[PDB]
Amino acid sequence: MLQPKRTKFRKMHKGRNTGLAHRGSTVAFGQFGLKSLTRGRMTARQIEAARRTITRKIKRGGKIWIRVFPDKPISNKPLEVRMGKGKGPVEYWVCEIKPGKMLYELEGISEELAREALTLAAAKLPFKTTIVKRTIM
Amino acid sequence: KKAARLRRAKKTRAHIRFLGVYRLTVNRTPKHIYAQIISPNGGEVIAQASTLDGSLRSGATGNADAATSVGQLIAERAKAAGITKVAFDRSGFKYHGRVKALAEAARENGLEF
Amino acid sequence: ARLKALYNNELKQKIKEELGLDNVMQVPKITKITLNMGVGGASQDKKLLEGAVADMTAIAGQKPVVTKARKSIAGFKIREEWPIGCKVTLRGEQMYEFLDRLIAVAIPRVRDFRGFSPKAFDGRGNYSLGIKEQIVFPEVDFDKIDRIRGMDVTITTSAATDDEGRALLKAFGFPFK
Amino acid sequence: MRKDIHPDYHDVLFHDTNADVFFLTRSTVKTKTTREYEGSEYPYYPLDISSASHP
Amino acid sequence: RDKIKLVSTAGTGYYYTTTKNKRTMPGKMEMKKFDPKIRQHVLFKEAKI
Amino acid sequence: GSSRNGRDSNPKMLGVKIFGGQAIVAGNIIVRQRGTEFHAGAGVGMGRDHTLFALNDGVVKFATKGKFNRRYVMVEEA
RNA sequence: GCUGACGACCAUAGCACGAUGGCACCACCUGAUCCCUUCCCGAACUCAGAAGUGAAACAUCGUCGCGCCAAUGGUAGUGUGGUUUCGACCAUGUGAGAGUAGGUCAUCGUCAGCU
RNA sequence: CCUCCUAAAGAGUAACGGAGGAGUACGAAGGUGCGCUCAGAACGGUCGGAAAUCGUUCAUAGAGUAUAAAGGCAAAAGCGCGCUUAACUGCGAGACCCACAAGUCGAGCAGGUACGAAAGUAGGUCUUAGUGAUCCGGUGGUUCUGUAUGGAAGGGCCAU
């Protein structure tokens, strides 16, 4: 359950998600990269589940890099409460995702096993994903 | 230190530039003393007098008497150049000793400030 | 000012010869001597300051100045702007005379002293020494002494480097390391 | 050196009997007994030990 | 910081109103202020307001 | 959960009042500001709230001058 | 040719490294009698002077080590009209930031002095 | 009432929208003249340490600015000293803001003043919060009025 240890402000605005992912579209740390073709919100629970499935598949044979962190807080309102009377608290944290953004990277493992693990992680995640080979340029 | 001396002269320099009057700036060294009159624009020298002048070059420079002389000659030069009302600029030097004698000579010899 | 007279005539030339300095002006000299007596007890009982000023004035030969604390610490319980320490600055002719008196009498009377550590220098050519007991100096009188207090002495030298600073002291004869 | 705000400061002669050495220097200390010195007469304070004799 | 009134020495009656703190200054305060009636600076004394 | 913070202050209407190249007479307020976002050069005076106003007739000019690269406002006689 | 004072401009003008400079000028530098200084100190400031040195500082020269400046092209955004799957797209006008090639050890003004 | 965002690069702009302060203080914490530069890091030094004071080297502000935040601050607006009361009187061309009532800035003129050798600065505090209309009553001045006339009462005008 990734979460910032402390934050300057408890609550944050909803914001708008637009544009392509110009930064973070290139794989650096690891040879094997998984990218998101669709924009959306990535929850900490989603990140944890994908990490756990990838770790189980690798069985300590490869190194995993997480390029997504849920710094942004999300406020949700409780049931049987009228609209207004103040903003709700941060039930959960999400990471804004843009098309082409790096989610996970793998190194030190065979391509086929990495592809299978990335397939499992994609199945868990809400984003369409295409595996991309790392390119120098 | 010349750095500190310029640091403590800038207040008066800026206030005189705001006033927009001709400025009688002094600059004294252990050997020589110089006085010159700068235009309100701050980039034109219209009158000058130092102990490098031939009249008092081969003499007791770096002295209160030399400062008094330089004041008298720059006062005459300013009178001949048409300047009558200036703002004194000790240029960070304490208004005292050679600077004070220079200022008093200039003030008594035609210039009023 | 026997040392002041001696330094220009003898010591300066031999320092230049010993260090093989290209130019005479490079040769170092002692710019200032500073004495510091910081005590925490002062400014609370308020009796310490008078005796400290008396002994410091008697030893130094100049009127000392009372510094004011610029910081407040909860652990030390010092509020802003209190007179916790006293210092004096000696230079030139009077400094050379003080240094002569110090070399003459102050260090020898010190009990259980063999020498000064060679690492005391900060590396920039400055020298610092600490005197355990103020009584060592002859100016103060043991009979009418309220309490014993230690002192700090600092010597400032133009040379930027410790080897030349130490050679400058050696020419003067400051007790061997 | 501001006037009148400083301690009494005067010539003093410091001698070591064991080393038989005379030193001349100005010190605030005052001595009841003085030794004659060819240059002039200034007060005497005895020294138990001297730097030169000190090992 | 109770209010105080300043009365001129001359007796013109022109007065100045200002606030002072009794704890930090219980004693009366004397100041020189311009007096329109006589057109000259004069001493002033604190008075009850 | 009640986080009671529904306060705000009234507007102050700061900003540039007369821009570059405009005719201006003595006394016109040029810039209302907090601190010296703009500084007063020749022909412009400075009030206690850091207001910049024209000391004489002319045309307002904006420039970046000096070592600190400060923004300056001047009134040129034109 | 160089030095000093006052300015324009405020890093392509800076920092860093190395070299040159003492006939003038500048700076250190000598002394604290006098003017004037220190909540102590001739450090600074101030005065009276040239025994000594360009050591430090200062000025000039050289470089690309840093800093700074910086294209062209492309991309992002964007006013107007239209379309839309609401992400965007088309026509037109505009056009960044970052990064890359590259550039830089400034350019001038008035007065005075030595040559 | 003040500061920031919402607020869409002039101003303005709402929510039981997201965050914090105010209902003071100072005769110096104002004015002027002069002078000074902080927080930290490392090294050395009696008690004395992680950190007291002293010395040295870097240090455009990583400090301080009476106070919440924004902006600003080197000619410092920050920090010290000497003398001082401009924390003045009568105003004030011209502007900002504004339904009104209000509110804000302001060169300059006249009188007196403080500082400075002087040109000069000073109509409170680096600015933006520290606030309350009218009626009524009280007080210090005032020749304006004064129910036949002279007074007085009361009323009016200025200050509070």
Side-chain angles (χ1 to χ4, degrees), chain B residues 38-69:
Chain B
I38 320 296
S39 56
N41 67 55
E44 182 65 26
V45 183
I46 63 175
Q48 63 84 0
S50 66
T51 57
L52 281 73
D53 189 67
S55 70
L56 73 165
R57 181 50 163 288
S58 296
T61 187
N63 201 1
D65 306 0
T68 303
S69 296

mmCIF file of all heavy atoms in Angstrom, chain B residues 38-69:
data_model
loop_
_atom_site.group_PDB
_atom_site.id
_atom_site.type_symbol
_atom_site.label_atom_id
_atom_site.label_comp_id
_atom_site.label_asym_id
_atom_site.label_seq_id
_atom_site.Cartn_x
_atom_site.Cartn_y
_atom_site.Cartn_z
ATOM 1 N N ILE B 38 30.551 66.397 -11.780
ATOM 2 C CA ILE B 38 29.835 65.537 -12.711
ATOM 3 C C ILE B 38 28.472 66.156 -12.987
ATOM 4 O O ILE B 38 27.853 66.750 -12.095
ATOM 5 C CB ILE B 38 29.673 64.103 -12.166
ATOM 6 C CG1 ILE B 38 30.938 63.636 -11.438
ATOM 7 C CG2 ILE B 38 29.302 63.149 -13.290
ATOM 8 C CD1 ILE B 38 32.160 63.511 -12.321
ATOM 9 N N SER B 39 28.011 66.007 -14.225
ATOM 10 C CA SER B 39 26.721 66.534 -14.629
ATOM 11 C C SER B 39 25.592 65.739 -13.979
ATOM 12 O O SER B 39 25.808 64.635 -13.474
ATOM 13 C CB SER B 39 26.585 66.485 -16.148
ATOM 14 O OG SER B 39 26.779 65.166 -16.629
ATOM 15 N N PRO B 40 24.372 66.284 -13.972
ATOM 16 C CA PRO B 40 23.250 65.532 -13.388
ATOM 17 C C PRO B 40 23.045 64.173 -14.030
ATOM 18 O O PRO B 40 22.545 63.254 -13.368
ATOM 19 C CB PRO B 40 22.050 66.459 -13.627
ATOM 20 C CG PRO B 40 22.642 67.823 -13.733
ATOM 21 C CD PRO B 40 23.962 67.629 -14.415
ATOM 22 N N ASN B 41 23.413 64.016 -15.303
ATOM 23 C CA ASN B 41 23.327 62.713 -15.952
ATOM 24 C C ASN B 41 24.336 61.721 -15.387
ATOM 25 O O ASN B 41 24.123 60.509 -15.503
ATOM 26 C CB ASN B 41 23.522 62.871 -17.460
ATOM 27 C CG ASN B 41 24.925 63.320 -17.828
ATOM 28 O OD1 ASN B 41 25.914 62.693 -17.447
ATOM 29 N ND2 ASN B 41 25.018 64.420 -18.565
ATOM 30 N N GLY B 42 25.424 62.202 -14.788
ATOM 31 C CA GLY B 42 26.365 61.344 -14.102
ATOM 32 C C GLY B 42 27.471 60.765 -14.957
ATOM 33 O O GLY B 42 28.252 59.950 -14.451
ATOM 34 N N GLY B 43 27.567 61.151 -16.228
ATOM 35 C CA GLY B 43 28.562 60.574 -17.111
ATOM 36 C C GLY B 43 29.451 61.587 -17.802
ATOM 37 O O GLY B 43 30.205 61.230 -18.714
ATOM 38 N N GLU B 44 29.381 62.850 -17.387
ATOM 39 C CA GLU B 44 30.164 63.919 -17.993
ATOM 40 C C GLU B 44 30.932 64.656 -16.907
ATOM 41 O O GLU B 44 30.349 65.064 -15.897
ATOM 42 C CB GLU B 44 29.266 64.897 -18.761
ATOM 43 C CG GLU B 44 30.017 66.021 -19.462
ATOM 44 C CD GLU B 44 30.926 65.519 -20.568
ATOM 45 O OE1 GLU B 44 30.644 64.437 -21.125
ATOM 46 O OE2 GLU B 44 31.920 66.207 -20.882
ATOM 47 N N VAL B 45 32.233 64.828 -17.121
ATOM 48 C CA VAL B 45 33.087 65.605 -16.229
ATOM 49 C C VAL B 45 33.310 66.965 -16.872
ATOM 50 O O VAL B 45 33.871 67.055 -17.973
ATOM 51 C CB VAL B 45 34.421 64.889 -15.962
ATOM 52 C CG1 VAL B 45 35.266 65.685 -14.976
ATOM 53 C CG2 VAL B 45 34.173 63.485 -15.435
ATOM 54 N N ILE B 46 32.880 68.024 -16.189
ATOM 55 C CA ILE B 46 32.957 69.378 -16.727
ATOM 56 C C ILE B 46 34.020 70.225 -16.050
ATOM 57 O O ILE B 46 34.410 71.263 -16.610
ATOM 58 C CB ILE B 46 31.592 70.093 -16.641
ATOM 59 C CG1 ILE B 46 31.167 70.258 -15.177
ATOM 60 C CG2 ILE B 46 30.551 69.317 -17.425
ATOM 61 C CD1 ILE B 46 29.901 71.064 -14.983
ATOM 62 N N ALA B 47 34.498 69.832 -14.875
ATOM 63 C CA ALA B 47 35.555 70.563 -14.196
ATOM 64 C C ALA B 47 36.281 69.601 -13.272
ATOM 65 O O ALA B 47 35.682 68.673 -12.725
ATOM 66 C CB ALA B 47 35.001 71.758 -13.411
ATOM 67 N N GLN B 48 37.581 69.828 -13.104
ATOM 68 C CA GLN B 48 38.396 68.950 -12.280
ATOM 69 C C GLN B 48 39.541 69.742 -11.671
ATOM 70 O O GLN B 48 39.970 70.769 -12.200
ATOM 71 C CB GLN B 48 38.931 67.764 -13.092
ATOM 72 C CG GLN B 48 39.861 68.155 -14.239
ATOM 73 C CD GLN B 48 41.302 68.356 -13.807
ATOM 74 O OE1 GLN B 48 41.641 68.209 -12.634
ATOM 75 N NE2 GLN B 48 42.159 68.710 -14.759
ATOM 76 N N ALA B 49 40.036 69.235 -10.543
ATOM 77 C CA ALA B 49 41.239 69.772 -9.921
ATOM 78 C C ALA B 49 41.812 68.704 -9.006
ATOM 79 O O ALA B 49 41.101 68.162 -8.153
ATOM 80 C CB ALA B 49 40.947 71.048 -9.130
ATOM 81 N N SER B 50 43.093 68.406 -9.188
ATOM 82 C CA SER B 50 43.786 67.425 -8.376
ATOM 83 C C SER B 50 45.162 67.975 -8.037
ATOM 84 O O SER B 50 45.574 69.029 -8.532
ATOM 85 C CB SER B 50 43.892 66.083 -9.105
ATOM 86 O OG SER B 50 44.716 66.193 -10.253
ATOM 87 N N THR B 51 45.879 67.250 -7.187
ATOM 88 C CA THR B 51 47.257 67.603 -6.887
ATOM 89 C C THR B 51 48.216 67.132 -7.971
ATOM 90 O O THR B 51 49.425 67.334 -7.837
ATOM 91 C CB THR B 51 47.670 67.030 -5.528
ATOM 92 O OG1 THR B 51 47.482 65.611 -5.524
ATOM 93 C CG2 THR B 51 46.843 67.654 -4.414
ATOM 94 N N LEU B 52 47.701 66.504 -9.030
ATOM 95 C CA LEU B 52 48.489 66.239 -10.225
ATOM 96 C C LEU B 52 48.630 67.467 -11.111
ATOM 97 O O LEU B 52 49.405 67.435 -12.073
ATOM 98 C CB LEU B 52 47.864 65.096 -11.029
ATOM 99 C CG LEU B 52 48.153 63.698 -10.486
ATOM 100 C CD1 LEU B 52 47.359 63.451 -9.222
ATOM 101 C CD2 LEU B 52 47.841 62.641 -11.533
ATOM 102 N N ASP B 53 47.899 68.540 -10.815
ATOM 103 C CA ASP B 53 48.065 69.784 -11.550
ATOM 104 C C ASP B 53 49.473 70.327 -11.347
ATOM 105 O O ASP B 53 50.034 70.251 -10.250
ATOM 106 C CB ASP B 53 47.029 70.812 -11.091
ATOM 107 C CG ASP B 53 47.004 72.047 -11.970
ATOM 108 O OD1 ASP B 53 46.612 71.931 -13.151
ATOM 109 O OD2 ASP B 53 47.379 73.133 -11.481
ATOM 110 N N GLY B 54 50.046 70.881 -12.416
ATOM 111 C CA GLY B 54 51.422 71.342 -12.347
ATOM 112 C C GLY B 54 51.647 72.399 -11.286
ATOM 113 O O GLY B 54 52.764 72.550 -10.782
ATOM 114 N N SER B 55 50.599 73.143 -10.926
ATOM 115 C CA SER B 55 50.755 74.202 -9.933
ATOM 116 C C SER B 55 51.168 73.636 -8.580
ATOM 117 O O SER B 55 52.016 74.216 -7.892
ATOM 118 C CB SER B 55 49.454 74.998 -9.811
ATOM 119 O OG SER B 55 48.438 74.225 -9.197
ATOM 120 N N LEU B 56 50.581 72.504 -8.180
ATOM 121 C CA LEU B 56 50.857 71.897 -6.882
ATOM 122 C C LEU B 56 51.244 70.428 -7.018
ATOM 123 O O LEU B 56 51.058 69.643 -6.084
ATOM 124 C CB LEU B 56 49.662 72.057 -5.939
ATOM 125 C CG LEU B 56 48.405 71.217 -6.192
ATOM 126 C CD1 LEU B 56 47.509 71.235 -4.965
ATOM 127 C CD2 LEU B 56 47.642 71.733 -7.400
ATOM 128 N N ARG B 57 51.788 70.039 -8.172
ATOM 129 C CA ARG B 57 52.313 68.685 -8.332
ATOM 130 C C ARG B 57 53.618 68.503 -7.567
ATOM 131 O O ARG B 57 53.748 67.592 -6.743
ATOM 132 C CB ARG B 57 52.506 68.373 -9.819
ATOM 133 C CG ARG B 57 53.041 66.974 -10.110
ATOM 134 C CD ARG B 57 52.264 65.886 -9.396
ATOM 135 N NE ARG B 57 52.507 64.568 -9.979
ATOM 136 C CZ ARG B 57 52.047 64.179 -11.165
ATOM 137 N NH1 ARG B 57 51.305 64.999 -11.897
ATOM 138 N NH2 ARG B 57 52.323 62.962 -11.616
ATOM 139 N N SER B 58 54.599 69.366 -7.828
ATOM 140 C CA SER B 58 55.892 69.284 -7.152
ATOM 141 C C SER B 58 55.809 70.039 -5.825
ATOM 142 O O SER B 58 56.381 71.113 -5.634
ATOM 143 C CB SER B 58 56.995 69.829 -8.049
ATOM 144 O OG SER B 58 57.136 69.036 -9.215
ATOM 145 N N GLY B 59 55.071 69.441 -4.899
ATOM 146 C CA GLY B 59 54.857 70.048 -3.607
ATOM 147 C C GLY B 59 54.396 69.024 -2.595
ATOM 148 O O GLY B 59 54.469 67.815 -2.825
ATOM 149 N N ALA B 60 53.914 69.530 -1.462
ATOM 150 C CA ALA B 60 53.479 68.686 -0.351
ATOM 151 C C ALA B 60 52.055 68.220 -0.626
ATOM 152 O O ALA B 60 51.082 68.792 -0.135
ATOM 153 C CB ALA B 60 53.574 69.442 0.968
ATOM 154 N N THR B 61 51.933 67.162 -1.424
ATOM 155 C CA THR B 61 50.631 66.584 -1.715
ATOM 156 C C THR B 61 50.220 65.636 -0.589
ATOM 157 O O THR B 61 50.975 65.381 0.354
ATOM 158 C CB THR B 61 50.652 65.873 -3.068
ATOM 159 O OG1 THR B 61 49.326 65.456 -3.414
ATOM 160 C CG2 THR B 61 51.586 64.667 -3.049
ATOM 161 N N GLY B 62 49.004 65.107 -0.683
ATOM 162 C CA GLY B 62 48.487 64.268 0.383
ATOM 163 C C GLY B 62 48.384 64.989 1.706
ATOM 164 O O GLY B 62 48.650 64.394 2.755
ATOM 165 N N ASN B 63 48.000 66.264 1.682
ATOM 166 C CA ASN B 63 48.012 67.106 2.869
ATOM 167 C C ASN B 63 46.734 67.929 2.931
ATOM 168 O O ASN B 63 46.048 68.130 1.926
ATOM 169 C CB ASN B 63 49.237 68.030 2.879
ATOM 170 C CG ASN B 63 49.575 68.533 4.266
ATOM 171 O OD1 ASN B 63 48.909 68.192 5.242
ATOM 172 N ND2 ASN B 63 50.620 69.346 4.361
ATOM 173 N N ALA B 64 46.419 68.401 4.141
ATOM 174 C CA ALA B 64 45.256 69.265 4.317
ATOM 175 C C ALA B 64 45.412 70.560 3.531
ATOM 176 O O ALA B 64 44.442 71.066 2.951
ATOM 177 C CB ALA B 64 45.045 69.564 5.801
ATOM 178 N N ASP B 65 46.625 71.114 3.499
ATOM 179 C CA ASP B 65 46.861 72.306 2.693
ATOM 180 C C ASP B 65 46.649 72.013 1.214
ATOM 181 O O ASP B 65 46.088 72.839 0.486
ATOM 182 C CB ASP B 65 48.275 72.830 2.940
ATOM 183 C CG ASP B 65 48.563 73.055 4.409
ATOM 184 O OD1 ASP B 65 47.663 72.799 5.235
ATOM 185 O OD2 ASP B 65 49.691 73.479 4.738
ATOM 186 N N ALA B 66 47.093 70.842 0.754
ATOM 187 C CA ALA B 66 46.875 70.472 -0.639
ATOM 188 C C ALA B 66 45.389 70.331 -0.944
ATOM 189 O O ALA B 66 44.931 70.724 -2.021
ATOM 190 C CB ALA B 66 47.615 69.174 -0.957
ATOM 191 N N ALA B 67 44.622 69.759 -0.011
ATOM 192 C CA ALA B 67 43.180 69.666 -0.212
ATOM 193 C C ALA B 67 42.546 71.048 -0.276
ATOM 194 O O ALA B 67 41.671 71.301 -1.115
ATOM 195 C CB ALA B 67 42.544 68.837 0.903
ATOM 196 N N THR B 68 42.974 71.958 0.599
ATOM 197 C CA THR B 68 42.453 73.321 0.551
ATOM 198 C C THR B 68 42.761 73.961 -0.797
ATOM 199 O O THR B 68 41.898 74.611 -1.408
ATOM 200 C CB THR B 68 43.051 74.147 1.694
ATOM 201 O OG1 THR B 68 42.771 73.511 2.947
ATOM 202 C CG2 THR B 68 42.463 75.544 1.716
ATOM 203 N N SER B 69 43.982 73.760 -1.294
ATOM 204 C CA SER B 69 44.335 74.306 -2.596
ATOM 205 C C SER B 69 43.449 73.721 -3.684
ATOM 206 O O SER B 69 42.824 74.467 -4.443
ATOM 207 C CB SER B 69 45.808 74.035 -2.899
ATOM 208 O OG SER B 69 46.646 74.705 -1.975
#
